[PDB]
CSV table of C-alpha atoms and ligand atoms in Angstrom, one decimal:
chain,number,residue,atom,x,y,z
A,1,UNK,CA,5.2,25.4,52.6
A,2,UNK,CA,3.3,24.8,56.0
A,3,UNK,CA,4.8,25.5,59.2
A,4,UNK,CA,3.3,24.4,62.5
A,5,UNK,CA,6.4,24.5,64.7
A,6,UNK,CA,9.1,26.7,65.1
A,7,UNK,CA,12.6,25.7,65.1
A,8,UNK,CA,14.2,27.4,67.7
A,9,UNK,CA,16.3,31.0,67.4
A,10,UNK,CA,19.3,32.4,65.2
A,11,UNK,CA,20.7,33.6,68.4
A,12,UNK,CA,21.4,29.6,69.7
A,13,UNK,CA,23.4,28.7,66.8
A,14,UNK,CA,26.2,30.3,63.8
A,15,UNK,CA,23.8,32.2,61.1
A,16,UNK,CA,27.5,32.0,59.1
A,17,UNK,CA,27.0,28.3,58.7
A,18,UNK,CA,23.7,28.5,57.0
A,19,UNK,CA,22.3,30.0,53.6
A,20,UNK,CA,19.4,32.5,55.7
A,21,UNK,CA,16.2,33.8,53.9
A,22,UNK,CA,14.3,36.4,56.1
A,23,UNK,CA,10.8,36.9,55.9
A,24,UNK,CA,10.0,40.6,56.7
A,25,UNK,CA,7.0,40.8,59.4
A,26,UNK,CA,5.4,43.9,61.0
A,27,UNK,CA,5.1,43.9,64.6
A,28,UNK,CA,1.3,43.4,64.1
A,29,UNK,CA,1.9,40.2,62.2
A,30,UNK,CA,3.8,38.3,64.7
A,31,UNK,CA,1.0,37.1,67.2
A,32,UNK,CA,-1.0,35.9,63.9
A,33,UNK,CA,-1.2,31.9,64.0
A,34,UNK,CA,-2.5,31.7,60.1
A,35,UNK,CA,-1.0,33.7,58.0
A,36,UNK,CA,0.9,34.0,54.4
A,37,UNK,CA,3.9,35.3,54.0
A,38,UNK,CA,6.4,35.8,51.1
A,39,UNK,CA,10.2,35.7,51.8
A,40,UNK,CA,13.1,38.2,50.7
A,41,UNK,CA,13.9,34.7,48.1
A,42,UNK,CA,10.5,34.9,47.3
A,43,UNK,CA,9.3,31.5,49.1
A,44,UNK,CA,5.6,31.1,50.2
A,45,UNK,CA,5.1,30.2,53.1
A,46,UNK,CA,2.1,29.9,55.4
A,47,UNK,CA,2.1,29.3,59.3
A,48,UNK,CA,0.0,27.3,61.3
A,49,UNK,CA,1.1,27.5,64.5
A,50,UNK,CA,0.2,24.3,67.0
A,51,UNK,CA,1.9,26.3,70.0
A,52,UNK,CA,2.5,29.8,68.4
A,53,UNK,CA,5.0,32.0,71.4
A,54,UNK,CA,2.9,33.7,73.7
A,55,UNK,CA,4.7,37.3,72.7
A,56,UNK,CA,4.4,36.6,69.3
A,57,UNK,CA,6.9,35.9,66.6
A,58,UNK,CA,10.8,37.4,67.8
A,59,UNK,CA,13.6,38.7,65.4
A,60,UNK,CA,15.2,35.5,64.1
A,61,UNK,CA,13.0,32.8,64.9
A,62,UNK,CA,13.6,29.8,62.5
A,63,UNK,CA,10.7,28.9,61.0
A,64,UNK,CA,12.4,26.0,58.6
A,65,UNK,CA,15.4,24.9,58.7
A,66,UNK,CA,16.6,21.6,56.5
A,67,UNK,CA,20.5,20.6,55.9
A,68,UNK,CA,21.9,24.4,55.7
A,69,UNK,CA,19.0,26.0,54.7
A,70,UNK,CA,16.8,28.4,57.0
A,71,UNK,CA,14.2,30.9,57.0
A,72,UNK,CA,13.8,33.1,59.3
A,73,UNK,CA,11.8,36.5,61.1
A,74,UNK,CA,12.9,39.6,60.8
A,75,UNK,CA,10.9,42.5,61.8
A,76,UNK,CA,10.2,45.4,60.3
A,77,UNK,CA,11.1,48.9,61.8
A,78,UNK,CA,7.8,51.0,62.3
A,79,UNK,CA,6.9,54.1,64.0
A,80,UNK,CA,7.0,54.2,67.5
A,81,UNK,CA,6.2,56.2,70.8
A,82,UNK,CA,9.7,56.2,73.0
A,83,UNK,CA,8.3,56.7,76.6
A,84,UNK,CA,10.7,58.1,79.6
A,85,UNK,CA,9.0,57.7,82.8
A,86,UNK,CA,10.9,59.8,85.4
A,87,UNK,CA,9.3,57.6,88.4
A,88,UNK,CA,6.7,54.7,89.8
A,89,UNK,CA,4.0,56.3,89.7
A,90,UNK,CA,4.4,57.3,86.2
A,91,UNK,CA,5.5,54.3,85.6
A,92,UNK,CA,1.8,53.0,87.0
A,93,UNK,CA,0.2,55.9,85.0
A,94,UNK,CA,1.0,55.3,81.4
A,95,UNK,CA,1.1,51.4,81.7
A,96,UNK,CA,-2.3,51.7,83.0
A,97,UNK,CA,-3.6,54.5,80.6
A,98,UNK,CA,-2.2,52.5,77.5
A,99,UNK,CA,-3.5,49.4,78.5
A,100,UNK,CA,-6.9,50.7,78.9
A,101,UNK,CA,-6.7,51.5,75.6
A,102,UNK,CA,-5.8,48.0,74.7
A,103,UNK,CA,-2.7,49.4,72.7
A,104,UNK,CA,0.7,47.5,72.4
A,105,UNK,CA,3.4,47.9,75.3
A,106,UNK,CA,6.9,47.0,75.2
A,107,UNK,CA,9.7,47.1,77.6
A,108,UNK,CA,12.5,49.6,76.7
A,109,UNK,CA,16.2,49.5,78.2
A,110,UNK,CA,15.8,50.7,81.4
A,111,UNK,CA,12.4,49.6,84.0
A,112,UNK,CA,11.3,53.4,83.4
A,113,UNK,CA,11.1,53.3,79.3
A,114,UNK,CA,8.5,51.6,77.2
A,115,UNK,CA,8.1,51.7,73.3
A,116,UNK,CA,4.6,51.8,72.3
A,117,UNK,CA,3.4,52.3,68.3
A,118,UNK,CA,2.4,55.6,67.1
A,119,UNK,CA,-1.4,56.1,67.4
A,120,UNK,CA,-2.4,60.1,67.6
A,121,UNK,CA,-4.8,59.0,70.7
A,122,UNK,CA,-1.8,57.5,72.5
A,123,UNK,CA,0.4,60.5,71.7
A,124,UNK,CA,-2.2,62.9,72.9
A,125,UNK,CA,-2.7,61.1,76.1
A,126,UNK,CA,1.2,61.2,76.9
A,127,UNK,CA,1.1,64.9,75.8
A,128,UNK,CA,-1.7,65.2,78.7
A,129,UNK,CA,0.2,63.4,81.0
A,130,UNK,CA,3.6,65.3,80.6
A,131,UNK,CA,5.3,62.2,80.2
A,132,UNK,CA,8.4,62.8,78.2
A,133,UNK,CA,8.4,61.0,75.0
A,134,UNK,CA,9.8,61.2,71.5
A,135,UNK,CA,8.5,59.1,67.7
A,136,UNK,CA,11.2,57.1,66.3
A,137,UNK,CA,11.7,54.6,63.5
A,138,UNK,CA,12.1,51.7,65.6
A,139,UNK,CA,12.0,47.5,65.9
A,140,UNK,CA,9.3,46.2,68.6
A,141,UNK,CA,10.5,43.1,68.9
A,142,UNK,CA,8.0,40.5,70.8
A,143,UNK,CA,10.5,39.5,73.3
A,144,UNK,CA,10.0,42.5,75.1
A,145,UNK,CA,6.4,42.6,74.9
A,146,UNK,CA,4.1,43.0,77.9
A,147,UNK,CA,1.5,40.5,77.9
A,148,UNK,CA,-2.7,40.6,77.9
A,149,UNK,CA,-3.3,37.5,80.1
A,150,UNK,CA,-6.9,37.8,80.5
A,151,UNK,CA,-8.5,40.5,78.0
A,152,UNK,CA,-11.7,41.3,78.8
B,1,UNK,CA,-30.2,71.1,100.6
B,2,UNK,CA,-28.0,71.4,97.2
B,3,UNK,CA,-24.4,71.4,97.0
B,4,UNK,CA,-22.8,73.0,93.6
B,5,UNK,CA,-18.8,73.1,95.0
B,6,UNK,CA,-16.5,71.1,97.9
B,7,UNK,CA,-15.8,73.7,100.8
B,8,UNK,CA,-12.4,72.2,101.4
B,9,UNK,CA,-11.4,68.9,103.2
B,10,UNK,CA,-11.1,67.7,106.9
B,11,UNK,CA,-7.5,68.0,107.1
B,12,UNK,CA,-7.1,71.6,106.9
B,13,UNK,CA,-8.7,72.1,109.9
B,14,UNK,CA,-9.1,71.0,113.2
B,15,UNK,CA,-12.4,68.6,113.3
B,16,UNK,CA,-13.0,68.6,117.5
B,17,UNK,CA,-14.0,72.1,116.8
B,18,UNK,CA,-16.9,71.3,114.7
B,19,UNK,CA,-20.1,69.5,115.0
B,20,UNK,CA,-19.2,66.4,111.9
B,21,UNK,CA,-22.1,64.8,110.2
B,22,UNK,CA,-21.0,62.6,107.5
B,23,UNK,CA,-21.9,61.2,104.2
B,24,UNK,CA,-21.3,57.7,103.6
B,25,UNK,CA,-20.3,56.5,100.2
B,26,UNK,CA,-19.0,53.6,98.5
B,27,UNK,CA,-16.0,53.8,96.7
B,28,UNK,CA,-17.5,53.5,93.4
B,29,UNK,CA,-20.0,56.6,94.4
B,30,UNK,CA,-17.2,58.8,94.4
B,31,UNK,CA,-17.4,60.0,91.1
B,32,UNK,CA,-20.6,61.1,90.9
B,33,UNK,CA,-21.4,64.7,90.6
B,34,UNK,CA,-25.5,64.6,90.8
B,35,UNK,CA,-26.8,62.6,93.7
B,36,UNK,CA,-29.2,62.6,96.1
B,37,UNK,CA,-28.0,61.5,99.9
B,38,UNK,CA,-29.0,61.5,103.7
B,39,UNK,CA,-26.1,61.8,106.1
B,40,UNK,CA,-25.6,59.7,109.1
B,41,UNK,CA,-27.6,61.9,111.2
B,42,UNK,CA,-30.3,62.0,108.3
B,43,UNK,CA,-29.8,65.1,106.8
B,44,UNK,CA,-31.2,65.5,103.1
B,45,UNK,CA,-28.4,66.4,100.9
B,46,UNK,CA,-28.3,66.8,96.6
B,47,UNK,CA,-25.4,67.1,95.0
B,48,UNK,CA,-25.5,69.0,91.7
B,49,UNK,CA,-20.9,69.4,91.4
B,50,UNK,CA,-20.2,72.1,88.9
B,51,UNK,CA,-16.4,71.4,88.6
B,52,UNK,CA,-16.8,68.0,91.0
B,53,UNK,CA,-12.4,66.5,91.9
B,54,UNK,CA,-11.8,64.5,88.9
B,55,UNK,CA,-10.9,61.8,90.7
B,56,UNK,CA,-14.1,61.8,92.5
B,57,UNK,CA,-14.5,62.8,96.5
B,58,UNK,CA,-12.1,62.2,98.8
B,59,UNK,CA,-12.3,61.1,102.2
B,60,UNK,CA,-13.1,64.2,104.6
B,61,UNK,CA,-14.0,66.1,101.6
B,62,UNK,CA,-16.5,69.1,103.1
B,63,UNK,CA,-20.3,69.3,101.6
B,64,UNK,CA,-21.0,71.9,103.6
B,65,UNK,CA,-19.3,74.2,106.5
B,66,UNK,CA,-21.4,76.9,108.5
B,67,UNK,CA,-20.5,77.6,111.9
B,68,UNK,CA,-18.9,74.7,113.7
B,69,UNK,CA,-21.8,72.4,111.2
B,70,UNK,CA,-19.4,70.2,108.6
B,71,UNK,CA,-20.9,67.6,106.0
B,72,UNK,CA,-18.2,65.4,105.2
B,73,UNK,CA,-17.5,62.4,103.3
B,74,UNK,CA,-16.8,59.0,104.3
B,75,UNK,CA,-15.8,56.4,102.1
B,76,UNK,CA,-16.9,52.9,103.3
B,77,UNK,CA,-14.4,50.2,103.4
B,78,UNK,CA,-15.0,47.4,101.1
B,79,UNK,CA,-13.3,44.2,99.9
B,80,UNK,CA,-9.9,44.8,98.2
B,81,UNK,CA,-7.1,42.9,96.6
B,82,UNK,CA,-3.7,44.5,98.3
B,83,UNK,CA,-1.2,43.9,95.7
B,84,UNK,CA,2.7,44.3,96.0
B,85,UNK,CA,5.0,44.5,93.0
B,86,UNK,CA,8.6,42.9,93.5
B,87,UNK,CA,10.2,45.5,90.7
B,88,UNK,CA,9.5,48.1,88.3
B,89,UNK,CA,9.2,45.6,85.7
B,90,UNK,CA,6.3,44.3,87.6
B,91,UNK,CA,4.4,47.2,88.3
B,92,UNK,CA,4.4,48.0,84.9
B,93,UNK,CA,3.1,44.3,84.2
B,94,UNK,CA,0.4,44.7,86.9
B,95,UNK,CA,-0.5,48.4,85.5
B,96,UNK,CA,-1.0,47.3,81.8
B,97,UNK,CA,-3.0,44.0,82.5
B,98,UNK,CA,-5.4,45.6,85.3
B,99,UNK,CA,-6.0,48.1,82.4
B,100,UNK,CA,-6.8,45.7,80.1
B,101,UNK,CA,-9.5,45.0,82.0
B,102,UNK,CA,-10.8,48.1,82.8
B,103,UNK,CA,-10.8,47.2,86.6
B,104,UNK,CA,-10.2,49.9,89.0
B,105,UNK,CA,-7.2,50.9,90.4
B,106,UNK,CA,-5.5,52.6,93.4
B,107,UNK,CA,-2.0,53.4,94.7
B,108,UNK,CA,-1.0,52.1,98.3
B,109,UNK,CA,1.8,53.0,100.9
B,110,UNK,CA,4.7,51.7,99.3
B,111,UNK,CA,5.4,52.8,95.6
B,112,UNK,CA,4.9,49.0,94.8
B,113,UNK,CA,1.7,48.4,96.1
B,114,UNK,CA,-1.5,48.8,94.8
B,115,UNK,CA,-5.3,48.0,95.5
B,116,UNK,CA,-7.9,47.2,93.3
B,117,UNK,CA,-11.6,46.5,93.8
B,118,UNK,CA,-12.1,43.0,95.0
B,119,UNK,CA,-13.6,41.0,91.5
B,120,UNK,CA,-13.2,37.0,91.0
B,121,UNK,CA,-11.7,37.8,87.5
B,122,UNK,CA,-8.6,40.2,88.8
B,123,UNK,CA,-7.9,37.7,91.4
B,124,UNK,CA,-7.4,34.8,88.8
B,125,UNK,CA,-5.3,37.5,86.7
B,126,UNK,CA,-3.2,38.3,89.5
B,127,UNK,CA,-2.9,34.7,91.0
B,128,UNK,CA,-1.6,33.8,86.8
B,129,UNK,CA,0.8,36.9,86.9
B,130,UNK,CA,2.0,34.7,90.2
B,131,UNK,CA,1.9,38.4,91.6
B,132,UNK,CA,2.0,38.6,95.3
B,133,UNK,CA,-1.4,39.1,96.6
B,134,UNK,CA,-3.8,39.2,99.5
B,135,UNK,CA,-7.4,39.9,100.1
B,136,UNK,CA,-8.9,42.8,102.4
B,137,UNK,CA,-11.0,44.6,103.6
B,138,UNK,CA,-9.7,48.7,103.3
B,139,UNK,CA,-10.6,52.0,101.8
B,140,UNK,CA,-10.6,53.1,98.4
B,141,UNK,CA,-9.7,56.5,98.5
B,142,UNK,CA,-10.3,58.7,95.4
B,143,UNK,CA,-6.9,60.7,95.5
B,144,UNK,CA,-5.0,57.4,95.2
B,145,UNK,CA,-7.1,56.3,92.2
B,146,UNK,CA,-4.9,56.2,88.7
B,147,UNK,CA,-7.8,57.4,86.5
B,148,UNK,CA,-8.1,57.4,82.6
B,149,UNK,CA,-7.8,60.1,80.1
C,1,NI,NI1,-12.0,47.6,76.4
């Protein structure tokens, strides 16, 4: 099946009153406008996103739902950086460092911690840095990307 | 004359004591560690850094010191964008997307504002962020620069 349009988000209505199938993406798979997909039921499904989310494709966005049936995202845990900035500046530092690597930032809890995935170059240049940071099995979910607004 | 090392900077000292010749450079002449330059006063100076600031010369950084004679360098105002973040969040924002780009960029007073290099393309970034903004003219000093690794 083809979808163009998402259908809104698990979190705005009762997943108890639905039958649910989840379709397993990676965080890298959920700013893809075509792509194929398989779900847990073992549906087909391709998007083709007319207006595809600017962050990308969040945990439980409804890609079809018809009388009490839905399909829906779920992302896949992956391995990622945990960063804990311990000020502005370093704040500043490793938001500029990563994104001049052009490498995936997310916000964490608090405004000083960010989630990035593991790449040995970005490891190595918070090692450099000092920034205190641990790897983790962890969900980036898109909602809390940061965005790349005009990439060179 | 060549210069292989900095001699220290202006503010470790008292200048009025000294006779002050300085160097002017742009701010994105900074980094450069072989160079050929006149001063103000039209001195002939090389610089051939062996272990040059990493992130590049700093205003009143000393060429050259003998007697009460100091070579030091200026940076030249230029044309900035003046940014100031409203919140953490924000500066991180500003941080990763200025990266993106590659574009330069300095910390100011505040630990929310920053200055970048004016270009056409970080003003239209900044002015779609809807991040508070104006434009300048000020210096770029190197030891506010964030640099990359
Ligand atoms: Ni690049």
């Amino acid at each position: 099946m083809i979808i163009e349009r998402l259908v809104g988000n698990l979190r705005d209505l009762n997943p108890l009153d639905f039958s649910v199938d989840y379709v397993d993406l990676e965080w890298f798979e959920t700013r893809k406008k075509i792509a194929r997909f398989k779900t847990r039921q073992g549906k087909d499904i391709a998007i083709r996103l007319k207006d595809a989310p600017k962050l990308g494709l969040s945990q439980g966005d409804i890609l079809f739902k018809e009388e009490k049936e839905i399909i829906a995202v779920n992302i896949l845990d992956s391995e990622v950086i945990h960063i804990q900035a311990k000020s502005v500046a370093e704040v500043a530092k490793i938001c500029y460092e990563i994104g001049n690597r052009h490498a995936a930032l997310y916000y964490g809890e608090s405004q000083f911690e960010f989630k990035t995935p593991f790449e040995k170059p970005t490891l190595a240049l918070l090692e450099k840095l000092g920034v205190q940071n641990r790897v983790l099995s962890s969900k980036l979910d898109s909602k809390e990307r940061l965005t790349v607004s005009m990439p060179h």
